Structures are given as C-alpha cells and as structure tokens.
Ligand binder design. Structure first.
Ligand code: HEC
Ligand code: HEC
Ligand code: HEM
Ligand code: HEM
Ligand code: HEM
Ligand code: HEM
Ligand code: FES
Lengths: 241, 379, 102, 81, 49, 379, 241, 81
C-alpha cells in the first residue's frame, strides 16, 4: 500500500523516434556489469557475438571473452572447457543455483536482468531513479537490516546495498567516474540488451514510411479513377406516361 | 459462355460465384471488413508457422527456445511480433465486422447470423490458448485461473478440471495438449469460413438503407475489388507501424518472467480484449452466479434477432434507438477501464453499476423503442 | 516488397548464428602416434592448428602427417592406420590412396 | 437464375455516363467536398458525442473519488489517533 | 465396440499413470515433535508442517 | 422438391451430389477403393493427433518421450501402432485404387488423372517425414541419405542441402522443421481430395466393360453404400489383427536404437514400400543418372494416357496386352526383393537386368500391342 | 562376412497366440538383473510400478524398491534424494555416462536392454542362443582378448565374459539354479519388458474375434437382402416392331 | 439436366422384379454358385499365373546363384593357396 512513484521521463540518446544508441557509453556500462552486477544478478542470454555492435573488434572482445570463462574440462574427457574459445558462450553465473543464489544473498533472490527492462513498468527511468534514490528513513519507520529504504522499491525497502557512488570505478575511456554518470552510463546498456536489433530495426521504419507515402495516394488516385464513373451518374425518368 | 475460360475446367464455373456476384451501389467502407477479415487470417497462418519451426513446447525448456527465436534466428524478432501484433488488430477487425451488423441491423438474415455467431466463439478461445504459449507468468496464472473458475459445477465439476489438466497441476499435459489445439484449431475455422459466406450468396448482399437495391447492382470484379486493394493494405500500415517503432505498446502484458508455480504476480488481468468479460466475472459475489453471468453475457447476440420489432430495418432511419446503440457502445467501452482496474470499492460499485445497466440497454430499451415510433409514425 | 519481404521468411530457414560458430577454428587435437580413434565429430571436428581444414577424412582427419609435421597420428596410427590406413571401408582396402595420401 | 438476367423487372429508366478519361480524378475535390464535411459531421454529432462526455467525467470523477479514499490516511482520521 | 473405442479414446487424455503417481507422495507424517517443524512435499507447492 | 429437407438449408442441396449420384450396375469390389481410401485418412487423423499430444520433438529429448508414450500413457501402446499400422495398409489401399485404373484403363478421363497423380506424389513424401519422427537410427541415416542424394545438381545443388538442413548436420532444424510439415501437410491433401472427386462428378462413373452404361444407372444411397459398409470394416480386421498379435511383423524396421550420428547400422534400406524406387537408384553407376532415373521413374504415370492407341477401352477385352499388364506386375514385385537385398553382384546384374526391362514393358510393348489387334480384328 | 546363424525356434509359455507370460520365472529373472546385468547394461524406462503384474505385493516391491536407490540429497536443499520413496523412480545406472561406461568396459559400449528385443532380429531365441553358445576358437582363428568367440555375435567375438553358469545364483523360490534355467528363466523377462500390456493386450484379440464373426455374415445377409432385387431382374424386349 | 430425366432415349424394354421379402438371401447359394468358381477361376488363370512362376524360380535361382558366390571361399580357390 505504498504510493507508487513514477520516474520523471528523461531525454535520452535513444529516446526520440530515430534516436539511436551510442555505444561509447554502452562499452563503458558493460565494464560496470563486468565490475558490479556480476556480483549476483546475471544475464544468461547473449553470446560474445556483440563484437562490433558494441564496437568491440573481433579480436578485442574475443581476447576480452577469453579471460572471462575458464572452468574444469578434465572429467574423463567429458568437459565443457576452460577459456571459452568462441563467442557462443554465455556468462558464468555467480551462483550455480537459486538455493546457492538466495542463501548467499540471505533470502533475497537477485533476478536475471536480461529482459528485466521489459518486465518492470516504466522503462529505464524506473531503474535510474531506483539507482538514484536512497532516502533517510522517515521518523516512524524501521527496516529489515539488509533492506535499504528507497521509495522506488515497491515495498520501499531493498536488501541491495547502494553500489554506485562517484567513482566506484574507472571507465575504459578514463572518463572521471561519477555516481550519476556511472549510473546514467549504464542506463543505455540494458535498454540495448532486450533488443539488439533496436538500432538496426529502426531502419525499416524510415524505409517503410517513404515507401508508404508512395502508394496510398497512388491507390487513392486509381480507386477514384474507377469510381469516377459511378459518382458521375445521371438519371432520367421519361415515362411514356 | 462460348469458349469462356470460366467453364473449360468445370472448376472455374464455381469461380463465377465472384466475378459476376452482383453488388450494391452505395456501400460504406464499413463493408470492407468482411473481406478484410480473411486477410489477417492468411497472413497469420504463415507467421506462427515459420515461428512454429524453431519453437518447441517442453515444460522445462520451451520458453527458453523463444529467447533463441527473436535473437539468433534469422530475422526471428520481426516474426514473433508479427504473428502477435496481428492478433489484436484482427480482433479489432472482428468487432467492426460485427459493428456493421447492428448499425444496419443486417442480422435479418437468420441462420447466417448464428453462423457468424459460432464462428467467432471459437476464435477468441483460440488465441487464449495461443496466449499460453509464451509461458509467461501472466500466462501461467491466467491459465491457472480460468480452469479453477470452471470447477464450480455442482456435481460433476471436479474431474473435468484435472481431466482437462491431466493432473493436479498446470504441467506438461496442460501445456503441450494445447500446442496441438492452439495450432490445429484455426484451420477448421478457415474451413468454416466459406460456409458462412455461402448463405450470403443465397440472397446477395445487404445495403445501408434497409432498402432492397435490386433495381441497381454492380459487377464485383472491377470495382469493390479496387476499394479492397486500398482497404486491405491500409491495415498493414499501423500493423507494420506499431510493430517496429512501439512494439510493446500493446505488449502491455509484461511477463517474460519465467513462470514461477509458487510465486504470484502483483496483478493478474487477462490481456486487453477479454477484460470486460473478465470484469463482469468480478461483479457477482456468487462465484457460480458470475459464470452463468459471464458466459451467457455474449450469448445475448444469438438473442438479438428475436427482438427486432420495427417496420423498417436500418437504424440510420430510426434516430431514437441510435442513441441506445451509441449508449451501449461506451457502456462496453466503460467496462473496459473498470475491468482495467483492481478490486477497490469506488470502482467496485461503479463496476457493480454498469452490469445491470448493460442488459437493460440491450434487452429492454432496444425492443421497447421502436414500438412507439410506429405509433408516432402512424404505422 | 517481396524481394526484401519474402527473403526474410525464407532466410529464417537458411542458417543460424549458432552453428555459424562451427567451421572449426580450434581444431586442435591431439593424439600422439597410434591411437586412432582420433575422431570426434562436430560434423567437422581451420582446423588452426595450422592451417588447415583441407581434409583427410571426417572426424579428426586431421591432415597428412600434417604435411609431415604433427597430425595426431601422423600416419602411422593404429588399426589400420592413418592415411593408408585402409581404414577405407569396413575397414579395407583402398585406404587413403589416391597416390601421395595428400 | 443467371444472376443478373432474372433479377427484377424495371421500366423506363435511363442512364448517362462517360469514359473515365473524359474527366479528372479531382473535379474540384477540395472546393466542392470540403463543405460536405459539415452536413455529415453535424448530422450525427447531435446524436452521438454527449454520452462519451459523461464517461470522461466519470473517468476523472471516480479517479478523484478514488484518489482521496486511499491516498491520504491522515485525512478522515488525521495521524492524531 | 463403440463403447470400447470411444471410451479407450477418452481415458487416454485423462490422466498419466505417472502423473497420478505424483499425487501426494508425502505421507510422513510424524517425524516432527509437537510444534517442531518438519517438512514434506505437497501437491507441488511447499508445505511447512 | 416440395418440402424436401434437401433444399431447406441451401447446404443440403449440395448434399444431393451423393444421394442421387447415379451409379453403374456391374461393379467390382475393385470400385470400393476410391471411397475406401478416405477411410484410412480419417482414422489416421485422430491417432497421430492424440499421439501428438504427449510426444515432443526436441533433438536431445524427443525420442525419450516416445518411450513414455507406449508405457505410462493411458493405452499409449495401442495408439502408436495404430497410426503406424494404418500407414502401410493405406498405401496398399493406394496402389489398388491405381490398380483398378489401368486394368479398366479408366484414365481416359484426362486431367482427373493428373489430379490423381499429384495427389499421390505428396502423400508418400508425407510419411517419409513421418518416418523421421521416431528418431531411430534407420530414420536418421535414411534421412541423412536422401538429402545427400539431392546435392548432385551441377551448379546450385550445394546450398539447397544445407538450406533444407539449416546447417551442416541433421540436427534440430532438420527435425523440428518437419514436425510441422509431417503434421501440417496432410490436411491440404484432404482439401485436395474433394477436388479430385469433383471432376468425376462431371461425367459420372466408369464401368468394367469400357461400355457407356447410361442405359442403366442406380441411386447410390441404398446400395453401394451397403457394399461400402461391408468393404469398409473388412480393412479394420487385418488392420486390427496385425496390430495386436504380430505388431512388429511389418515393423521390420528395427531401430529403437537412439540414433548415433557417428555410428552407422550394418544395413540401410528405407521401409518396405519405397524400396523398388530406392532399388532403381542403385542401378545407374552415374549418381546423377539414377536421379533422373529414380524421380522420373514414377512420372511415367503422367505419360500413360498419351499411349492409349486402341479402339476399345477396357483391357478385359484385349487379352494380349493383359499379359503385359501382369507381366509388368511381377516386374514391379520383382524389383522389391532385389531392392530387398544388398549390393552384391548376382543380385546386381539381376537388378541391372529388370531396370531397362521395366521401361520396355510399359513404354513400348503396351503401345505396340493394340495396333495389331485392330488389324487382327479388321479394324 | 560371417554366415549369419539363426536361432531354432523354441516353444514358449507365451509363444502361442493366446499363450501368456508366467510371472513365476519373471520374478526370478528379475533377480538376475538385480544380480547380473546391473553390472553394465541398463534399463531406464520402467518405474517400480510393476508391482502386482510381476506379482509383487504393493509393499513387497515397495520395500524392495526402497533398498535399490540413490545418492545424496543434501546439496543446499537441491537434489534428488536417498531411498526412492515412490515407484516412479528408475534404476541407478551403473555408469553415469558412455565415457564412464565405455572406458570401464574398455572400448565396449554396453547397450540399454529395455527394448533391445525389438531391436535385434529374431526374437528371444537370438539371445538365449547367444546366452547358450560359446565355442572353442577354431584352428586358424584368434581374438581380441576381451572378445570371446560365439558365432551368435555378428563378428562372432564379444567382450562380454559368459556370465551364466549352472548356479550362478539362488532363485527367489529356491529353485536349483542352472545355466540353461538361469538363462531360460530370464528369456521371458525382457520379452515382457518392451510390452507390459502384452498380457493385457491379448484380451482384445479374443474380444474382437467373437465380436467380429458376429457382424460380417449379418452385414453379408443385409447387403444381399438389398441386392436380392437387382440380381432378380428380368428383361423383356417386346417391340411394337 | 435433371440427372435421370434427360439421360438417353430408350424404347420397348420391360423389367420384372419382386419384393426382397418374396425370396431368400440364399437361393441355392452353395449348390448353384460353387460351379461358377471354375469358369472364372479358369478364365484368367490361363492368362495370368505363369509369369509369376518364372519369378519364383528367379527368386530361388538367383539366391542359390548368389549363395555359392560368397558363402564358400574354399570353393573356386580352396584354402590351398
Ligand atoms: C549485493 C550484491 C549485489 C550487487 C553488488 C548488485 N546487485 Fe543489485 N541486487 C542484489 C540483491 C540480492 C537484490 C535484492 C535485495 C533484496 O531482495 O532485498 C538486488 C536488487 C537489485 C535489483 C532490484 C531487485 C529486482 O527484483 O529487480 C536490481 C534491478 C539489481 N539489483 C540490479 C543490480 C544493479 C543494476 C547493480 C549495479 C548498480 C547491482 N544489482 C549490483 C544483488 C546485487
Ligand atoms: C562384464 C560386465 C557385464 C556383464 C556381467 C553382463 N553384461 Fe553383457 N555385456 C557387457 C559388455 C561390455 C558387452 C559388449 C562386449 C563388447 O562389446 O565386446 C556385453 C554384451 C552384451 C550383449 C550383446 C551386446 C549388444 O550390443 O547387445 C547383451 C545383450 C548383454 N551383454 C546383456 C547382458 C546379459 C543378458 C547379461 C546376463 C547374462 C549381461 N549382459 C551381463 C557387459 C556386461
Ligand atoms: C473472422 C470472422 C469472419 C469472417 C472472415 C467473415 C467473413 C465475412 C465476409 C467475407 C462477409 C461478406 C462481406 C461482409 O458482409 O462483411 C461477411 C459477412 C457477414 N458476416 Fe462474417 N465474417 C466473420 C465474422 C462474422 C461474425 C463474427 C459474424 C456475426 C457474429 C458474422 C456475420 C456476418 C454477417 C451478418 C454478414 C453480412 C453483413 C452485411 O450484410 O453487411 N461474420 N463475413
Ligand atoms: C488469427 C490467427 C491466430 C491467432 C490470433 C493466434 C494466437 C496466438 C497467440 C495468442 C499467440 C501468443 C501471443 C504471443 O506470442 O505474443 C500466438 C503465437 C503463436 N501462434 Fe497463434 N494464433 C493464430 C493462428 C496461428 C497460426 C496460423 C499458427 C501457426 C501456423 C499459430 C501458432 C502460433 C505459434 C507457433 C505461436 C508461437 C509464437 C509465439 O508464441 O511467440 N497460431 N498465436
Ligand atoms: C488417397 C488418395 C485418393 C483418394 C482418397 C481417392 C479418392 C477417390 C474416390 C472416392 C474415387 C471415386 C471412387 C473410385 O472411382 O475409386 C476416386 C476415383 C478415381 N481416382 Fe482417386 N483417389 C485417390 C487417389 C487417386 C490416385 C493416386 C489416382 C491416380 C494416380 C486417382 C485417380 C482416380 C481415378 C482415375 C478415379 C476414377 C477411377 C474409375 O473410374 O474407376 N485417385 N478416387
Ligand atoms: C495417412 C496419414 C498419415 C501417415 C501415413 C503419416 C505418417 C506417419 C509416419 C510415417 C509416422 C511414423 C511411423 C511410426 O511412428 O511408426 C507417423 C507417426 C506420427 N504421425 Fe503421421 N502421418 C499421417 C497423418 C498424420 C496425422 C493425421 C498426424 C497427426 C494428427 C500425424 C502425425 C504423426 C505423429 C504425431 C506421429 C507420432 C507417432 C509416432 O511417430 O510414433 N500424421 N505418421
Ligand atoms: S478466486 Fe482467488 S480471490 Fe477470487
């Protein structure tokens, strides 16, 4: 029975219709996951195939891929692998198992974030706010210890300790790392996640439109051209009477 | 018919049920719909088909495959949404086809109606199962609800639940049974489609004016075919426009959440178009009451032709009833938004209000009105 | 329309980014001398290794003594052997000849 | 029988028409048609719109009516007792 | 045989004998002192008892 | 037609294409087949359907499900075999329908033939995919062969392999693509079925005697309907008799062996009915040669109506050709057993023998014969 | 290129049409699997549901089931469990894995025997012979060490060491255990395996037959009854001519 | 037209028949029909059977012809050399 707050709508690089994603921040925001969210929340669904779309050179992310993986491979010739090899591989999960996952976070179940944007209502500003907002417990409230008070959380208490502060990290660029920037630099990343085709798919939009304005007036011409006769009728009642 | 390519194969003689089908002069775009309907049906058939290829129903695995579908499959993403994004459009294509029905009251054609009736009833049930396929949470519970709604039958209700289930749960059988049905089914509908057309070609088309037009008719092949050509593609636009720019707009159902049998979402509503029917379910406190309320609620359509009392057909010459006609329209549109909301009291009463309002509109007012006009009009 | 349009439906069938990962990049492996065995499958398993991916047979061919260098193997191998071999059909007699086994 | 032949009996009607090439696809389309908008747009609008307006009120009406009902607990009972 | 065949049809879709095998395997029921919580496997939702 | 329940719904007027269909007097049981055919088609439809429910195609899992099917599913075992054990019977129902064709040479009806042609060609291809479903080894390699047989096209052949494959292997796509096709397909056949009937009801039936019977005809509803009633159920017996006592008799394909992509069985032959076609594949040393040999081999049927040279129709009055007719029969039946054997020279030559023998029988002898009889018979 | 021998057809308890299975030997032959074949070859497909069909009392095989099973159960609340509980469970596989399986038998791959009867040509006498036959290497032959010469094997050499000798075991009955008996007592068991319904399914056979002889003459009567008129025709050409 | 009406023209044929109840479903079925077996059974059997007999020979003929060809290696070459 919390008043459900809604995030103010922010402009974005992608916000507008034809507005695209910018990979520069996407590259950075990856590192964040490479740094932070690999703690608990996973993303299982994307191969290392990102390469050039996130601008990664074939070698760049391949060699980047190489370090990520590396587990066993010697069980009586039955294996998996160390050192992924190709890009098809996915991320190691920080937990093998919800049992292993939840207990580690002590009753909390970190969700997989792959599509989570499309899950939660209200787009990215949901999280960016949820990133931003942490408030001082009001007078007359208490929390479960792990739960940390943000009105953005639905029950407004979350076991997630605020990860982001100004310069949690250093970006790949060397850009000065800032709580908001570090936060805002990621907000493009998952927005990309659920829809890799996003950038590409918009092409058809402009493609179809100019294609579209073509034919309709054309059709609209033809139709009338036929109907030109019917609406041109005359009638004459000239009875022999 | 000397050397006419119509009779040379006997087959094309049948094809003369179209070319030379006579046709009425004045016709709203509102008569595009009948032909417009079949359009969606076709375009669908392909989409779910090629989609059917890479997808598989296996209770553990199935949903996972879908992820694979929009991502690693050639153009997998455009396709999923297509089959989906046609669906609601198709339904809006539906009611309109109905819509023309009463506004000109063409239901004078008798069993044809009843055909048009049954034809529909299957269709909605279809995608219902179709909606299970994505295996989302909302799917899961939504599935879980309605069967649990069924059981209330006084004596025999019980087994039929776990009979359709095939167990105590929502598990494999419940699913993969349907992946047959949600698939096998629509064809028979197509088979049915032609039948619904046949009867119409007993009598020929109806008009706007409730006036037999027989004095004037038109060869179909040149003309309405054209207006079709226009009317057809127009659909595609929004259909293709929604899909790309704002795909998830009508994708209001949010769950790609792998369905947790234990966990329950904060909210369960069926997808957009059920909801008024679903809303009316809430109304009756008697759980059984709402059932005979809900299912019957649409069955009223069968009952309309019984209540035509007037001496002239098309509404457009009876102004009074026309009010009711619209009056009913929003009343439908009303129940939506109420249905579009949870079970708090201010809505509840409001919801409780329009229910009995609803029937009165159709069941009494409409038959009541025309009588007086006759007297008013000296009939 | 159709030229883009029909392509899309069609191309779905065509191939997938999954097995697109095949066409060995690895290969890499391994054996020593005889073994053979020396197969796997992977419908294929550049090579690379080096280079190679010409072939010898299916299932860890891997080359003709890898042109005297490595192979696995490197001909001889166990019954019958690597290329000639024979080890032709169940398992005799035509081997990998041909002539020079390359 | 043959769909057109036996339709009906009609007497002493006459029809007049041209080739479509004889004329244009826009015989004063703008000028002539734009007035027609009103006579149809006024015709039904008497009969149709108002019911929706009532709805739209209810939309805000009940929402507002809803809103207070929950949104503020220190309303009927303020946080005093 | 109509009563054979029509029947032999229907009873197919009805129930998997293995699905039936999975109703309430939990028998237990003691194992647990008074107030002392044991656990068991219900119809497939968890049960604290 | 006063108050006749035929015209009251317009629909049942169509139903008078049957009741009052006139019919020939003297008719062999050999005319039961046409109606007999559709019988199998129906009974099938249900079987694979309810079977489709518990089964799933997933390359890893799928076959496993089948084990579950005949074992733990209610009456799962009777059902699998049914759908299967109909299949071959249906084919033997097939050729007979053809069989009547030439023995009375009714192919005089022209495009009707061509219809009956295409109608078949699909059907065999159907179960071909159907046979993949069990995912046995013999399925797997048998599947693996024929596509690998396709590739020999000089320029474009390559891609089409991995195009139909959807990869370099026999894997998922190859399978689960088909589980659509092997399923979706037969309906359209049923749709096609009626068409093949229509044409026949242009001219009415043919006879034994090659003599227009128009002097005498019979109302169909009373009589042949009865002989149907008999002729229909008779099938079921052996059909139900084989299935229970000696299920695997025709279950000669032995592989419930989970298909090993690496491992190859000691022997690969397609199932029983292909084999003569498959046999003829072996004959040509040219791999391409056998292709234009194999596929064309059946296409000859299209070409028969071109070669009718006689002045009287039904064979039963031309004794000489009748020999060829039978002479051809065993020749078919011959290629079976040769095809039923490995590739080993005494058979090889023998197999190599009947090939060119085969065409000569049909292609030359048959047209050659009748000419002389005319002269012999003073025509 | 071995001459392929074929087993002489033996009579059986089930051999004839209506000939049923006898569970007494089936019960025994189970123990054999419970003793022998659990070594390598598995059967994965049958639950403990056998109970009363193999005559096992509900408790009898349940308590019998209880002993058979399986490992662990303590991995952070996730996994399987000890002591099967219900009958749905299957047998533990002596090998986790073909890798584990084959190497253990050193290049040999023991097959799962569930349906294997229906796999091999020639019914049971195939195996019973294959059980029976072991011969003395002919002069002019040698073998792979593990391979043991029987003409029944297709290459006529098998890594399976002959398991069955007279009194390998003691039957449940206490019947004196005999190589042939021990062999022949099993041959009914797998024959049952691929077709549990076997015994039951035959019922319909006799059911349908007497049902069948009913209707055909009946039909055969009716048909003729109609045709009685047609074949009764007469014709008279009485031209005014 | 109407299927039976316009079929053909026929003149001065006469037909004679009874109710089916007037007679039996076995008017000397055995006695009368059993001879008929032959005249049909003999009619075609002249024209039809023999080709198969040739086949059946080939069946055994080639098999036998096959059999030696492999079955015994110490045949053409005995195991001497
Ligand atoms: C402490 C390990 C950890 C860290 C580091 C971490 N997550 Fe959190 N996260 C959790 C857990 C556990 C929860 C839920 C806490 C609870 O349930 O009380 C959570 C909450 C969340 C939620 C909302 C919970 C939900 O159901 O969606 C999101 C989204 C999320 N994390 C993503 C992130 C993001 C984004 C970051 C980087 C800012 C991040 N995680 C870093 C473990 C972590
Ligand atoms: C030594 C462990 C072991 C024992 C004990 C054992 N099996 Fe064997 N069995 C094998 C292995 C390994 C093979 C194959 C040997 C080879 O491939 O060279 C084999 C051969 C077979 C075969 C034929 C191989 C095939 O492909 O079908 C069958 C059938 C079989 N065993 C079943 C049985 C039966 C019946 C018994 C009881 C008489 C039994 N196993 C006991 C491991 C065993
Ligand atoms: C997808 C479903 C349907 C399809 C494909 C379909 C198809 C058609 C077509 C092609 C026509 C002729 C053009 C027209 O009059 O609209 C038609 C007419 C009609 N249909 Fe259907 N229809 C469908 C649904 C229905 C339904 C649901 C009903 C009634 C509940 C119905 C009742 C009618 C009626 C009454 C007409 C004649 C209407 C008139 O005279 O204007 N149809 N339909
Ligand atoms: C009017 C026609 C149809 C409708 C309304 C319908 C209904 C649905 C629904 C409700 C879904 C799930 C919605 C979603 O996934 O977003 C769906 C997807 C699907 N439908 Fe249909 N169905 C129709 C015809 C078909 C046809 C013709 C096929 C197959 C040839 C089919 C098979 C499928 C399949 C395989 C899917 C999986 C794709 C997916 O779920 O994402 N349906 N359809
Ligand atoms: C399952 C496939 C088929 C079905 C369901 C089917 C159905 C029928 C039916 C009901 C008849 C009328 C009764 C009869 O004359 O037999 C018929 C006749 C016929 N069909 Fe088809 N038929 C099938 C296959 C074929 C094929 C494969 C051919 C030719 C290749 C064919 C050509 C004919 C011909 C020529 C006739 C007329 C034969 C005559 O006059 O005796 N049909 N078919
Ligand atoms: C003349 C009609 C049909 C034929 C000849 C045919 C062909 C086949 C074949 C060759 C198999 C595998 C053979 C076997 O499993 O022993 C099979 C099984 C199957 N068929 Fe069909 N099909 C036909 C119609 C259908 C229909 C109508 C369906 C589904 C409604 C269907 C779906 C299946 C399915 C699901 C199976 C799985 C059962 C199994 O493979 O054991 N087929 N059918
Ligand atoms: S049914 Fe659960 S609350 Fe109404």
């Amino acid at each position: 029975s919390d008043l459900e707050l809604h995030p103010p709508s922010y402009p974005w690089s992608h916000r507008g219709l034809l507005s695209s994603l910018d990979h520069t921040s996407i590259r950075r925001g990856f590192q964040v996951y490479k740094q932070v969210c690999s703690s608990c929340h996973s993303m299982d669904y994307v191969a290392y195939r990102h390469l050039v779309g996130v601008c990664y050179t074939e070698d760049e992310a391949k060699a980047l891929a190489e370090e990520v993986e590396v587990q066993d491979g010697p069980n009586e010739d039955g294996e998996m692998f160390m050192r992924p090899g190709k890009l098809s591989d996915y991320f190691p999960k920080p937990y093998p198992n919800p049992e292993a996952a939840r207990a580690a976070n002590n009753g909390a179940l970190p969700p997989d974030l792959s599509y989570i944007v499309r899950a939660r209502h209200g787009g990215e500003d949901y999280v960016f706010s949820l990133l931003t907002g942490y408030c001082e417990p009001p007078t007359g409230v208490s929390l479960r210890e792990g739960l940390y008070f943000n009105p953005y959380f639905p029950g407004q208490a979350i076991g997630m300790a605020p990860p982001i502060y100004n310069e949690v990290l250093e970006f790949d660029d060397g850009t000065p790392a800032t709580m908001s920037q570090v936060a805002k630099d990621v907000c493009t990343f998952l927005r990309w996640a659920a829809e890799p085709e996003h950038d590409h798919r918009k092409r058809m939009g402009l493609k179809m439109l100019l294609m579209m304005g073509l034919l309709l007036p054309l059709v609209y011409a033809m139709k009338r051209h036929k109907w030109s006769v019917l609406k041109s009728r005359k009638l004459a009642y000239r009875p022999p009477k | 018919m000397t050397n006419i390519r119509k009779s040379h194969p006997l087959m094309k003689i049948v094809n003369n049920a179209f070319i030379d089908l006579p046709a009425p002069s004045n016709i709203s775009s509102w008569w595009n719909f009948g032909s417009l309907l079949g359009i969606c049906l076709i375009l669908q058939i392909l989409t779910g088909l090629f989609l059917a290829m890479h997808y598989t129903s296996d209770t553990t695995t199935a949903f996972s495959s879908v992820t694979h579908i929009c991502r690693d499959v050639n153009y997998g993403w455009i396709i999923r949404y297509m089959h989906a994004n046609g669906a609601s459009m198709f339904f809006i294509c539906l009611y309109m086809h109905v819509g023309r029905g009463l506004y000109y009251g063409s239901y004078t054609f008798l069993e044809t109606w009843n055909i048009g009736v049954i034809l529909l009833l299957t269709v909605m049930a279809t995608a219902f199962m179709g909606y299970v396929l994505p295996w989302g949470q909302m799917s899961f519970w939504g599935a879980t609800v309605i069967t649990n709604l069924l059981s209330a039958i006084p004596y025999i209700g019980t087994n039929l639940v776990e009979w359709i289930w095939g167990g105590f749960s929502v598990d494999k059988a419940t699913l993969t049974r349907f992946f047959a049905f949600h698939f096998i089914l629509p064809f028979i509908i197509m088979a049915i489609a032609m039948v619904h057309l046949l009867f119409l070609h007993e009598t020929g088309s109806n008009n706007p004016t409730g006036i037999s037009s027989d004095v004037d008719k038109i060869p179909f092949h040149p003309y309405y075919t054209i207006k079709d050509i226009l009317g057809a593609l127009l659909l595609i636009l929004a259909l293709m426009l929604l899909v790309l720019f704002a795909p998830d707009l009508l994708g209001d159902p949010d769950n790609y959440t792998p369905a947790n049998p234990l966990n329950t979402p904060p909210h369960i509503k069926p997808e957009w178009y059920f909801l008024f029917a679903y809303a009316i379910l809430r109304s009756i406190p008697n759980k059984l009451g709402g059932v005979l309320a809900l299912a019957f609620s649409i069955l009223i359509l069968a009952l309309i032709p019984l209540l035509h009392t007037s001496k002239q057909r098309s509404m457009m010459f009876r102004p009074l009833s026309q009010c009711l006609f619209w009056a009913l329209v929003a009343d439908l549109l009303t129940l939506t938004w109420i249905g579009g909301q949870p079970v708090e009291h201010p809505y509840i009463t409001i919801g409780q209000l329009a229910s009995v309002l609803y029937f009165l509109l159709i069941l009494v007012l409409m038959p009541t009105a025309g009588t007086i006009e006759n007297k008013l009009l000296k009939w | 329309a159709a030229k883009n349009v029909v392509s899309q439906f069609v191309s779905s069938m065509s191939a997938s980014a999954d097995v697109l990962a095949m066409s060995k990049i690895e290969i890499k492996l391994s054996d020593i001398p005889e073994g053979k065995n020396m197969a796997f499958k992977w419908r294929g398993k550049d090579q690379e290794a080096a280079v190679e991916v010409s072939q010898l047979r299916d299932p860890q061919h891997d080359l003709e003594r890898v042109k005297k260098p490595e192979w696995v193997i490197l001909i001889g191998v166990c019954t019958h052997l690597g290329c000639v071999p024979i080890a032709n059909a169940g398992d005799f007699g035509g081997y990998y000849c041909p002539c020079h086994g390359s | 029988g043959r769909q057109f032949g036996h339709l009906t009996r009609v007497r002493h009607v006459i029809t007049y028409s041209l080739s479509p090439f004889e004329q244009r696809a826009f015989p004063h389309y703008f000028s002539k048609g734009i007035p027609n908008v009103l006579r149809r747009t006024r015709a039904c609008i008497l009969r149709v719109a108002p019911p929706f307006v009532a709805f739209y009120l209810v939309y805000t009406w009940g929402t507002q009516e809803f809103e207070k009902s929950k949104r503020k607990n220190p309303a009927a009972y303020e946080n005093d007792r | 045989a109509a009563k054979n065949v029509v029947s032999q049809f229907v009873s197919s879709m009805s129930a998997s004998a293995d699905v039936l095998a999975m109703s309430k395997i939990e028998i237990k029921l003691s194992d647990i002192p008074e107030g002392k919580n044991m656990a068991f496997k219900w119809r497939g939702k968890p049960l604290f008892v």
